[PDB]
Amino acid sequence: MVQPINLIFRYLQNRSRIQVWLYEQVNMRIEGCIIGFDEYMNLVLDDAEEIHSKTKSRKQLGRIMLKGDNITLLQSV
Amino acid sequence: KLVRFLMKLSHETVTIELKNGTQVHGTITGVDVSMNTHLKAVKMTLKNREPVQLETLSIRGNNIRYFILPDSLPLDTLLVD
Amino acid sequence: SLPLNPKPFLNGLTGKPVMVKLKWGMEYKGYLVSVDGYMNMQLANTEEYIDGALSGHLGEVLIRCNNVLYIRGV
Amino acid sequence: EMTPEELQKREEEEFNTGPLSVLTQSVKNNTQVLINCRNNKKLLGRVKAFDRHCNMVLENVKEMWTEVKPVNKDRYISKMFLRGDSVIVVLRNPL
Amino acid sequence: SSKMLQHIDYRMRCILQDGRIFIGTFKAFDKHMNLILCDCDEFRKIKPKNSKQAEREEKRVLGLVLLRGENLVSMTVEGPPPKDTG
Amino acid sequence: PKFYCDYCDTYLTHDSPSVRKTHCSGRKHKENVKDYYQKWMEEQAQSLID
Amino acid sequence: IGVPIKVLHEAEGHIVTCETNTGEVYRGKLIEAEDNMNCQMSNITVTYRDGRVAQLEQVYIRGSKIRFLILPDMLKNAPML
Amino acid sequence: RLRMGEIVIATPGRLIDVLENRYLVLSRCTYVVLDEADRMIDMGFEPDVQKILEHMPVSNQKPDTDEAEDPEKMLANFESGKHKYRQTVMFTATMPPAVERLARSYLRRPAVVYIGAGKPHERVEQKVFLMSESEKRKKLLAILEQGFDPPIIIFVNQKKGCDVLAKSLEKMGYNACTLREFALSNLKAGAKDILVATDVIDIQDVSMVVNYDMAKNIEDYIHRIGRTGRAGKSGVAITFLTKEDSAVFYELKQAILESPVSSPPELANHPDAQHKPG
Amino acid sequence: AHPPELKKFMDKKLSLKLNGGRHVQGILRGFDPFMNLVIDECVEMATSGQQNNIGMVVIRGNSIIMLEALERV
Amino acid sequence: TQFLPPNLLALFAPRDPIPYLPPLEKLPHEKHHNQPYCGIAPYIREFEDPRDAPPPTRAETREERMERKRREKIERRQQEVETELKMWDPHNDPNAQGDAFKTLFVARVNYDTTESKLRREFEVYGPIKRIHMVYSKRSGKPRGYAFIEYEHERDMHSAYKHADGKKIDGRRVLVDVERGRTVKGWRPRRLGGGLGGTRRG
RNA sequence: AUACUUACCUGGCAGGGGAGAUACCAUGAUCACGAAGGUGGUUUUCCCAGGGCGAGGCUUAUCCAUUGCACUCCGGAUGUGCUGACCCCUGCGAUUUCCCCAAAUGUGGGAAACUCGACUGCAUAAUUUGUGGUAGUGGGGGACUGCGUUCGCGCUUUCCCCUG
Numbered sequence A: 001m002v003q004p005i006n007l008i009f010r011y012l013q014n015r016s017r018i019q020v021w022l023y024e025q026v027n028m029r030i031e032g033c034i035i036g037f038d039e040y041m042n043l044v045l046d047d048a049e050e051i052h053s054k055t056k057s058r059k060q061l062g063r064i065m066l067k068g069d070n071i072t073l074l075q076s077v
Numbered sequence B: 001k002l003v004r005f006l007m008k009l010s011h012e013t014v015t016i017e018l019k020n021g022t023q024v025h026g027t028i029t030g031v032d033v034s035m036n037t038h039l040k041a042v043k044m045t046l047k048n049r050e051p052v053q054l055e056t057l058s059i060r061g062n063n064i065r066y067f068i069l070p071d072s073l074p075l076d077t078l079l080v081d
Numbered sequence C: 001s002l003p004l005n006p007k008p009f010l011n012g013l014t015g016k017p018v019m020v021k022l023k024w025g026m027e028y029k030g031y032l033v034s035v036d037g038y039m040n041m042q043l044a045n046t047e048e049y050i051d052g053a054l055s056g057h058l059g060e061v062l063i064r065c066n067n068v069l070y071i072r073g074v
Numbered sequence D: 001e002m003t004p005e006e007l008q009k010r011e012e013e014e015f016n017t018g019p020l021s022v023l024t025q026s027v028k029n030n031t032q033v034l035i036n037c038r039n040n041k042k043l044l045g046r047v048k049a050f051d052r053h054c055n056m057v058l059e060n061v062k063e064m065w066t067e068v069k070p071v072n073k074d075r076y077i078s079k080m081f082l083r084g085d086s087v088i089v090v091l092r093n094p095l
Numbered sequence E: 001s002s003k004m005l006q007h008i009d010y011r012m013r014c015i016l017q018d019g020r021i022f023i024g025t026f027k028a029f030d031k032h033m034n035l036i037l038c039d040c041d042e043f044r045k046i047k048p049k050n051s052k053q054a055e056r057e058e059k060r061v062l063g064l065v066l067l068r069g070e071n072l073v074s075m076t077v078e079g080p081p082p083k084d085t086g
Numbered sequence F: 001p002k003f004y005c006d007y008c009d010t011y012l013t014h015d016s017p018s019v020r021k022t023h024c025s026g027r028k029h030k031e032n033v034k035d036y037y038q039k040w041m042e043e044q045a046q047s048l049i050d
Numbered sequence G: 001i002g003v004p005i006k007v008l009h010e011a012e013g014h015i016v017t018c019e020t021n022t023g024e025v026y027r028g029k030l031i032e033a034e035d036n037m038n039c040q041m042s043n044i045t046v047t048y049r050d051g052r053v054a055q056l057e058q059v060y061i062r063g064s065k066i067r068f069l070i071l072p073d074m075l076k077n078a079p080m081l
Numbered sequence H: 001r002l003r004m005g006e007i008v009i010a011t012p013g014r015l016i017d018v019l020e021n022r023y024l025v026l027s028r029c030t031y032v033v034l035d036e037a038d039r040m041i042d043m044g045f046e047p048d049v050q051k052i053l054e055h056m057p058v059s060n061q062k063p064d065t066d067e068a069e070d071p072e073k074m075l076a077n078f079e080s081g082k083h084k085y086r087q088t089v090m091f092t093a094t095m096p097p098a099v100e101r102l103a104r105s106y107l108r109r110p111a112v113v114y115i116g117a118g119k120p121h122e123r124v125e126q127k128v129f130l131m132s133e134s135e136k137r138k139k140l141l142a143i144l145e146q147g148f149d150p151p152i153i154i155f156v157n158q159k160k161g162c163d164v165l166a167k168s169l170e171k172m173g174y175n176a177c178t179l180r181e182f183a184l185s186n187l188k189a190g191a192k193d194i195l196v197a198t199d200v201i202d203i204q205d206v207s208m209v210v211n212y213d214m215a216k217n218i219e220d221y222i223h224r225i226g227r228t229g230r231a232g233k234s235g236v237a238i239t240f241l242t243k244e245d246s247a248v249f250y251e252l253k254q255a256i257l258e259s260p261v262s263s264p265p266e267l268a269n270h271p272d273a274q275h276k277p278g
Numbered sequence I: 001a002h003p004p005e006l007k008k009f010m011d012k013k014l015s016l017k018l019n020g021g022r023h024v025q026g027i028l029r030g031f032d033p034f035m036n037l038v039i040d041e042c043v044e045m046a047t048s049g050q051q052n053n054i055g056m057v058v059i060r061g062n063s064i065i066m067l068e069a070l071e072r073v
Numbered sequence J: 001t002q003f004l005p006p007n008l009l010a011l012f013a014p015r016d017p018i019p020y021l022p023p024l025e026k027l028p029h030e031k032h033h034n035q036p037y038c039g040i041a042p043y044i045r046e047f048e049d050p051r052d053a054p055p056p057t058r059a060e061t062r063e064e065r066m067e068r069k070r071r072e073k074i075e076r077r078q079q080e081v082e083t084e085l086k087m088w089d090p091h092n093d094p095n096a097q098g099d100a101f102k103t104l105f106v107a108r109v110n111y112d113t114t115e116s117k118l119r120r121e122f123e124v125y126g127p128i129k130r131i132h133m134v135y136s137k138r139s140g141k142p143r144g145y146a147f148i149e150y151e152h153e154r155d156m157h158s159a160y161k162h163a164d165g166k167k168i169d170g171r172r173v174l175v176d177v178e179r180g181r182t183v184k185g186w187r188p189r190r191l192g193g194g195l196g197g198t199r200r201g
Numbered sequence K: 001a002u003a004c005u006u007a008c009c010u011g012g013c014a015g016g017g018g019a020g021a022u023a024c025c026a027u028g029a030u031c032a033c034g035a036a037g038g039u040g041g042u043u044u045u046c047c048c049a050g051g052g053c054g055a056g057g058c059u060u061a062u063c064c065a066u067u068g069c070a071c072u073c074c075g076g077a078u079g080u081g082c083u084g085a086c087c088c089c090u091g092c093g094a095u096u097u098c099c100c101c102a103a104a105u106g107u108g109g110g111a112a113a114c115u116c117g118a119c120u121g122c123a124u125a126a127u128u129u130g131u132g133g134u135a136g137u138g139g140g141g142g143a144c145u146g147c148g149u150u151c152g153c154g155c156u157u158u159c160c161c162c163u164g
Ligand SMILES: [Zn+2]
Pocket: F005, F007, F008, F023, F024, F029
């Protein structure tokens, strides 16, 4: 069994660029590199940007902590 | 804990506003630690509906937005425990 | 960088200007003063940005942790 | 917990220094306070007491909101207990 | 807990978060306020866009229901227990 | 939270998913259940007696 | 464990209807329920929000996303009740 | 411990439940051991041991041909490292049909290794006294007063017995231990002379074992008297028999009649020693 | 804090109803007592009939409504 | 109910499936928010502080009257003791005579013990110049203690080493040196000093 | 069924009103009659929590009595649901040992032993219920747009009202 905490750790190590689907927010997503995280599934994202469906335009954020409650799914590149 | 306070309000007559706009006016028979609340002599007024009078009502505490307390209710007395 | 995690990330940010974005669309900018194990935040010299552009200047602010979407430096 | 022993007035330290100091100090100095609430009304009043959840007992509150052109509305409520979950943001009176 | 027990086995009208009413014989509860309702009937109010016309009440029978506490708002007493004396 | 079997009139001092399943797929248990609903069919004889 | 959850486990093996938060309705054989009210079910007639129905083989539902379940009436004659 | 990740040691009931709930899998298992398979059978574990086998991946079992016991081929397979056939070992004292069933399923062309000191009753001097329960304490004292070579062991059936008998002896001016390492050191050292104990480690050869209470089965009795040592001085085991022990008389009688270093008509001729119990 | 009983669905192709009216499908490689999932060879199932492949992915348990086994367990 | 004879298990049969009805509320992500959550910036009416209340209101109740009362008793007590203290001077007491350095202090005496029995018990250590047992100036009941002046300091020291705990008339007595007239800063127990710890708490 | 033995599965910890005040009793307080207090009683005031007793009253039907002249309610009986003063009790429903009161195998008083009713507190405000993405931004009646139209409506822009 691959277990979800490890797979996040894998994403961390690889410095993979992660895209997050948001909880109850369907228009925005967020993507960035997972520098760190915790038990609550809060993420530290290194080069984060906020991506909107209608615009196809991306707002640059820098280094962010995103609270866990929001996440609905974690994706690659 | 501050529900400890609400649990002291038995026999007090209050007005409760619910997260869904329902307003309850009644007399508190008991409040429990999850803020679940029991009332007697109730006038429940669902959002945009005519009031309805009820002998009794219990409210699951998560649904409470606030209690409106009697103008005279002695807060300092009641807040010491 | 090491694995840089949430608690020490914020502890980094404390003292510095920060911007916090709420689940409900408003954002609050100001000097992160404190945070707790639930990640409630106190801000100072706080200002309110509604829909991206500045709305007004507020003051000392508590933000209840459930409301926060993300928080970021300056 | 981090404090699994049941001597934890570490809360009392967290109230004095942590972010709920906003309240502890507001209660202490009887300062007004403006709360943006999840019914989307704003309550401006005094804080008589509070707890971890941000449950507050308030006095001399003015609830203010906004209906429909957009019209302002307000009502005075002299003593309330607000359930903490419904707090978004609290703001101490600047001056 | 006697505040809840005392209404146990009465016919009780429960308001759910979506505005449904469950009326049912109140057989059991727990710390969540999950409910067990017997012979439970669901009612709901349907708005008229057709005319400034009377509301539909729509009954629908469910039978034995387990209601998750999260979805409960309030409950008041509808009637006494279905009675075993004549 | 400590589990009480209404059929067996016995306790599981420490409940777990594993423990309750073990108990419930138990010799004593299944017999008690069978008995309980047989006894309920006897309730039906108490109908005709009226 | 609460009386109502016990009752849920007693309906393991039988036909239950289950409305989810989303408004879908799943009717089928309840295989296994957990204490959280996570339910595995078989042979379901899902009924989508619109009214359209479908057939599903094997399904599992998060307890936190259930509104209510409809259990077999016979369960009312379980021992507590 | 399970979460952490080479060898699992288990009992059948526990192991099947764990497998059934997928707390553990047998994905890279290449080594299967059944220890005391006869005892597993006796306990009713045949079906559970069957069901456990059903979780092993089938494709790593050896072929059922003469090649399974060809040394050149099987050695080359052992050395093949990670991809070798599984191997299975069964240990057992006996081969009743159920054990042979296990073997037919679990094993492929197994070699048998049979070995064979192991039978203390044949080589330990045994003496018995028939009495009523109330007579035990005075007979023990009379025996002790004759003098002994410390340390000795006195066995009793229940742990309360252990404690109260031990007190009385210390009252009679005897150095008595009850039953960790600390006890055996003193005995070994000469400090304490008498160990009182129930059927529940590792201890020196003793000159004398007294069964103050007779064991409830002959296997426990055998283990007790075995404490006079594997070899060397025969030593002596003295047993107090009462009417409450009638269900072990027949086997006790056999144990002694099979002991050339032992002389007992009182038991051998007793009405309760004539037929197997039950 | 008991784990969920998703041994049955391990290494099976699933179709998952998710929070925002979002649907996703793929092979279940693991899970948590929060019911967080690992899906493999996962496909987006966007509202437009269009499907998109993002392979290995983490789903928060919180946002899973119902899952259906496509390969029948 | 699970694995029963199909005989009985047919009792646990479902009722017919329930009529469809459309949902009452839209799905939360697809609802139209006519006045969405909004901020507080417009709202800094507040109140200019020159009309603001001062802070201190709150505090003890019965809890304040109680705390005040203990506080005063304690202080009142300290003043009493201070005043007595400057009346206290054992160098000017007619009861305290002779060489303090040759004087033994004996406490915890049986009230029944006579001055004779005491002089007998303590004579063993050497000739006694003087015994003064102490009595209440009120009741005249014995206080349970005495001063014994020896002829020679050496003999006092000897009683001191050897007599402590000595049992006289059933009671273990306490033996020390006289400190009233020898020890810098001594105060007796009634003046907040003293030795011994029977009633520390 | 009961007791024990072995194996397997499981396993948090802590408790029993609180806070004041007590002049009196015990603790016979180690310095020339005395601590204060603390601790244990006693009494008592708050915070009060669960029981006991049920006077009185409310409601509705069977039977019985009543044909009566009032303007101060108000015949009897029986039963389902209720409300409930005064005055009591202090915590609880089961077990084992010792000491004493004694109307002495009865009936009491004092200790503990650790035992269950999932009693309460807690790293429990962090994804599955007990501290929010269920927010509570209307429905209707007239004036007042266009677009498509099957002319019923769908979408969209307003005004004035009713109303939750
Ligand atoms: Zn059972």
